């Protein structure tokens, strides 16, 4: 069983997973909507009481299972809890990252396609509409947003061909394994990623128009209202953001950690990776989108831009903004090339869990594990590419509800069923530094309490709407992803039989 070649490689790979489009798109929007600078108070608390502890736990559960030749939760859950039901709950550790990869690699391909377009100068060229319109029409023609009643997407041939190229790039990295593939790429992509971010931050900071300056936007995202704190919605928003940004509950971290040597440090290493992500989010991420947008639209509208959604901000607003500044074309290319590496380092992280299962449990060669996974993903993605709101449906069940539920699940199994003391000693073993003793109570009582509340709130507020309001096409996806869970349950069955 392969291991991470170096300490740095491990950290850069883990950090690579956490760092994502959310650092540059979702955070600025969430921060601006939930109290600006005041949002940092719940954000930091959530990072301490939910973010870090759960990360250490996943890291530990991964390294624990790896020592016995297991990198996926169906097996690992069974180790921590010898019970038939534990293996089924573990199937989610395969289902979640798989379903997410089905629509995420496609979303990822978009950024590449835009990057290719901006690079070739094939991008489109008064009021805020005649400037945004050419780009909205560009995006909708790309991903094939329906101009008719039918719930059918009509992706451009270019969009489709780019998805194949993106799938290929992913396979090229994964098929080389952990150290010679994921790790080797991580050591290159991460520095590259931070260089593009910093460069953009600087270039954006030098933006000025009669309507506002980039510094204005910075003096808005960080000017604390301190009145939203009373609103419990902000605390829920903060815990959510923290949970999403650290990529917790995907089972991806567990799989990555399973390649860590049995008593190699995970406390300091995990803390480092998490810090890299928080720097790329609050410092780098929260200094490109909003500031650049505010620079042109003005301090005024600041709310609207954030409210307009995290997606419209990155794929419509900014590109149009760039096409207005000098040399903004090359500037927009750097933006999407940044978002592409951001996604590329994460897509390989969520496709690995499936690969690991095939290797460890079904004893497939890396080549066969990677290709078969690639096939399952590529095929399944056609449902997301051609069926409207399919992406949204998957993102909710797996990428939203699923991740939180699974997060609370793995925490209860490891710290309650497995044993609080045993779990604590497992986490700290080999640690360059020891986990603060206070965290023993946090992990055992606090962390699970926050997650339970986040689930109860998101459930009572989201599920009834999804079940009733949504179009009937929604079932074609539900049917398919339910089938995927049944499929994985069958593979786990065959694994135990062999």
């Amino acid at each position, epitope marked *: 069983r392969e291991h991470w070649a*170096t*300490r740095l490689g491990l950290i850069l790979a883990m950090a690579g997973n956490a760092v994502g489009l959310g650092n540059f798109l979702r955070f600025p929007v969430q921060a601006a909507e939930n109290g600006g600078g005041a949002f940092m108070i719940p954000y930091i608390i959530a990072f301490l009481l939910v973010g870090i502890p759960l990360m250490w736990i996943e890291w530990a559960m991964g390294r624990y299972g790896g020592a016995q030749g297991h990198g996926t939760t169906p097996a690992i859950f069974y180790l921590l809890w010898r019970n038939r039901f534990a293996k089924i709950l573990g199937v989610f550790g395969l289902w979640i990252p798989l379903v997410v990869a089905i629509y995420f690699v496609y979303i990822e391909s978009w950024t590449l396609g835009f990057a290719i377009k901006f690079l070739v100068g094939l991008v489109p060229e008064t009021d805020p509409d005649s400037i945004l319109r050419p780009f909205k029409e560009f995006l909708y023609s790309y991903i094939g947003v329906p101009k008719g009643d039918e719930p059918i997407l009509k992706p451009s041939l270019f969009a489709y061909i780019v998805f194949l190229i993106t799938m290929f790039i992913n396979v090229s990295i994964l098929i080389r394994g952990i150290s010679k593939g994921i790790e080797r790429f991580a050591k290159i992509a991460m520095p590259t990623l931070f260089i593009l971010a910093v460069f953009l931050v600087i270039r954006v900071f030098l933006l000025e128009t009669p309507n506002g300056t980039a510094a204005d936007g910075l003096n808005f995202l960080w000017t604390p209202d301190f009145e939203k704190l009373k609103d419990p919605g902000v605390w829920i928003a903060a815990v959510g953001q923290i949970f999403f940004t650290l990529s917790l509950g995907f089972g991806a971290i567990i799989t990555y950690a399973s390649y860590v040597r049995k*008593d190699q440090d995970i406390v300091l290493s995990g803390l480092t990776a998490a810090t890299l992500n928080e720097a790329a989010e609050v410092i780098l991420g929260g200094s490109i989108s909003i500031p650049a947008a505010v620079a042109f639209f003005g301090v005024a509208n600041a709310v609207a831009i954030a409210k307009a959604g995290a997606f419209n901000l990155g794929f419509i607003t900014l590109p149009a903004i760039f096409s207005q500044t000098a040399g903004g074309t090359f500037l927009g290319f750097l933006w999407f090339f940044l978002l592409f590496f951001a996604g590329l380092t994460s897509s390989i992280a969520i496709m690995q869990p499936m690969i690991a299962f095939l290797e460890d449990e079904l004893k497939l060669s890396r080549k066969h594990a990677v290709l078969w996974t690639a096939a399952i993903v590529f095929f399944s993605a056609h449902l997301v590419m051609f069926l409207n709101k399919s992406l949204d449906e998957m993102d909710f069940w797996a990428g939203t509800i699923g991740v939180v539920f699974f997060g609370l699940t793995e925490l209860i199994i490891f710290f309650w069923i497995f044993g609080a003391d*045993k779990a604590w*000693e*497992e986490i700290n*073993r*080999g640690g*360059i530094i020891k986990v603060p003793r206070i965290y023993y109570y946090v992990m055992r009582y606090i962390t699970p309490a926050f997650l339970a509340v986040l689930l109860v709130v998101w459930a009572r507020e989201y599920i009834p709407k999804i079940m009733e309001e949504t179009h009937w096409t929604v079932w074609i996806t539900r049917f398919y992803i339910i089938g995927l869970f049944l499929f994985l349950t069958f593979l786990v069955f065959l694994a135990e039989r062999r």
Partner: antibody
Amino acid sequence: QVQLQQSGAELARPGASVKLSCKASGYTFTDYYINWMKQRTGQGLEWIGEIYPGVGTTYYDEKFKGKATLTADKSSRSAYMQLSSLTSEDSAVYFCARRTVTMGRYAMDYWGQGTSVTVSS
Amino acid sequence: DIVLTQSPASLAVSLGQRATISCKASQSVDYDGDSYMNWYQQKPGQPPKLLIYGASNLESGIPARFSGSGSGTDFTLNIHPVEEEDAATYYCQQSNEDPYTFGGGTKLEIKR
């Protein structure tokens, strides 16, 4: 004053079972592993396996698993090893040792005086 | 298993001279900058004693006469100058992967 003390001079008839002990002190028992060594008179050292008392997990050399059984009581800072279905070839000296977990230095820095097991009728 | 082969099996050196044991591993014992090769000294009747860890690191309490070197698969134990009390068997040991393995051991004879 890191010290590992072992039971001594155990004698047992062929087929019977024996259980060596290893009382540790002078350090945090949970932060380290305790492993076992077999050394026959006039021969080299054999690694039997190890255990992390802090969690309880055990590791064996495929040769010895079934023959040896590693346990440990975290409370008494003590570690045990049971040898089953004893043979004349189980007659040897058995060392328990503390293996460091800090990196990069996984080594045994403290040993017990060793236990001489004799299997005869 | 990573088999360790020591050489020579037996060695005789004078009270002023240098003693050199070598340990050849079947495969690399290195990992992320560190070399997990260890050296032990065993006098008759008592347990082994940690001389060198990490291939080149002198264990606290051990005389500077003992030094370690090498990496990958090649390692050598150096005792200089040799003393009457250096009479013992020496083992090399790898901690790279389970199971842990020892070298055949080299009996050091002090020439008088």
